[PDB]
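Bug report

Summary: structure tokens for Pancreatic alpha-amylase differ between web form and batch submission.
Environment: batch mode, default settings.
Steps: 1) Submit the sequence below via batch. 2) Compare with the web form result.

Sequence submitted:
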Amino acid sequence: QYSPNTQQGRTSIVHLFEWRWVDIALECERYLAPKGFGGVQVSPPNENVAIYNPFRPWWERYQPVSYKLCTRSGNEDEFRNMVTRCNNVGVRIYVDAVINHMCGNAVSAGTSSTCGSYFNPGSRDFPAVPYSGWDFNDGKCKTGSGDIENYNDATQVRDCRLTGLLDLALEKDYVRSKIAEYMNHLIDIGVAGFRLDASKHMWPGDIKAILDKLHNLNSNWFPAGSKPFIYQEVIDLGGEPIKSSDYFGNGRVTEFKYGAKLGTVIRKWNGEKMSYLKNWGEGWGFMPSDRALVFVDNHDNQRGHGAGGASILTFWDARLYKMAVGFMLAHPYGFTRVMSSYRWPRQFQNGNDVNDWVGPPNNNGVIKEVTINPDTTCGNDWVCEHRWRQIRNMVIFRNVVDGQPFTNWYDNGSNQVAFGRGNRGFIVFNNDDWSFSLTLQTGLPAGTYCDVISGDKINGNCTGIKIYVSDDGKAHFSISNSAEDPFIAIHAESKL
Ligand SMILES: OC[C@H]1O[C@H](O[C@H]2[C@H](O)[C@@H](O)[C@@H](O)O[C@@H]2CO)[C@H](O)[C@@H](O)[C@@H]1O
Ligand SMILES: OC[C@H]1O[C@H](O[C@H]2[C@H](O)[C@@H](O)[C@@H](O)O[C@@H]2CO)[C@H](O)[C@@H](O)[C@@H]1O
Ligand SMILES: OC[C@H]1O[C@H](O[C@H]2[C@H](O)[C@@H](O)[C@@H](O)O[C@@H]2CO)[C@H](O)[C@@H](O)[C@@H]1O
Ligand SMILES: OC[C@H]1O[C@H](O[C@H]2[C@H](O)[C@@H](O)[C@@H](O)O[C@@H]2CO)[C@H](O)[C@@H](O)[C@@H]1O
Ligand SMILES: OC[C@H]1O[C@@H](O)[C@H](O)[C@@H](O)[C@@H]1O
Ligand SMILES: [Ca+2]
Ligand SMILES: [Cl-]
């Protein structure tokens, strides 16, 4: 469960949040494969409640109605077409598996669902699965409300309703089997793995019992005996009885400490400085690198959901965001996930975004196509961070340097830092309020290298900055604190 099953030489996943299957299929072929992306995390592909108040929020996709592959991203034929086309160009698909719960217990009964299936939350009736009242934890939960009330009580966190979401009885073989049926359907289509939603809200052994029922990956694309990559969403910032390590038997685990701390460092909040990143990783109290799924922001915390956190960096803070993503992609710790977002009309009243619920760009609830502009950015209010040059080129940096040791660290005692990855790449950051002008040991072979932050290598030349590495491996770097992108990155495949 720990191997990502990406092609060799591809080292990151991109979350194409709320994208349609037909758009992802095209993206695989026209962009993700030639740019060396390892795979795509997709939004939940199973039927969910169509919530009309507020109007079609993103979070309706976390309220299942059935396991039919029928959503605003598309139908089963489109989903299958996408997985096939992506695998055929070497780009994997990872499914957001929403298996802890069905929908909210206060949702009205009817057919307000993305495939029109009938469901009745009050009576616990989900006949398109089917599930009945026997399949929920209503009798097992011990709180007075039936909901989770106290995170200091690990039992209620698992057995009670998260914010009223009907909690599936994952200790029952019937329920485990219906979930496995769904996940095996997806495996056989060709999915390479799963993001397991709300993993803290499930017992590790119930997750295990489900995974035990799963097939090996599709043997047309994956070697015999390949297992789905599993990465579990567990928010563990410390101080709770449930720990991310409790889930290591099932797969990797999201390291939410990563983006929380990195955001505070890059914002220069709380006395933090980039020079302290010299021991980034386990030295900062993070889980083992071979289990961490790392990221700057995710779909919840870029809008204050989940654990939130004011320090989280997002596309709204583009300059600092690019720096944080760049540091993450250059540093060997963890398996990296890049976010790809849509814009929404963020509006703060008191201190909260009252539009944090807004769903993807849409016309009367129909998700808009991802249109591609001539400069390779996206239209229709899709942000497409994964197409920003500075991020796309850092995805390739990570591939080029894969396996190479962290080395040649420099810092000025403040926020001017640099480091290399063996003899294959070097990166330099200036987050201080003055210019960084210095000759540094890069560890690289002598030559002229294109800076992949400011430009690209093409036709034996560079479209941005050029760095000149001498025979002794030293090169001069000058980065103004006024730079739009105050970091420079060079690697073996950007050498002229
Ligand atoms: O503007 C806040 C809130 O107003 C409406 O919510 C109402 C709902 O319509 C009523 O049927 C009842 O349930 O009380 C709700 C507010 O407590 C909107 O439906 C909702 O989207 C909006 O957030
Ligand atoms: O109706 C149940 C429940 O749904 C919404 O909760 C969202 C939550 O906002 C998201 O962060 C994510 O976890 O998915 C949840 C389920 O859709 C409402 O926000 C919540 O108040 C409501 O009780
Ligand atoms: O809301 C912050 C508070 O609750 C969190 O619960 C999360 C849930 O655990 C996650 O699976 C996420 O996807 O949505 C929920 C948000 O309600 C955190 O578990 C908790 O540590 C935090 O204090
Ligand atoms: O080491 C992890 C730790 O780094 C920073 O804390 C210390 C650092 O360990 C020391 O080398 C010292 O010189 O500076 C820092 C204290 O100012 C981070 O501040 C800390 O958050 C992090 O866990
Ligand atoms: O390990 C899985 C088990 O953990 C427990 O102790 C729960 O009470 C049970 O419902 C669950 O099946
Ligand atoms: Ca549960
Ligand atoms: Cl996540």
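Above is the batch result. After comparison, the two runs are identical; trailing whitespace caused the diff. DSSP finds eight helices and 24 strands in the chain. The chain has two domains: 2-403, 404-496.
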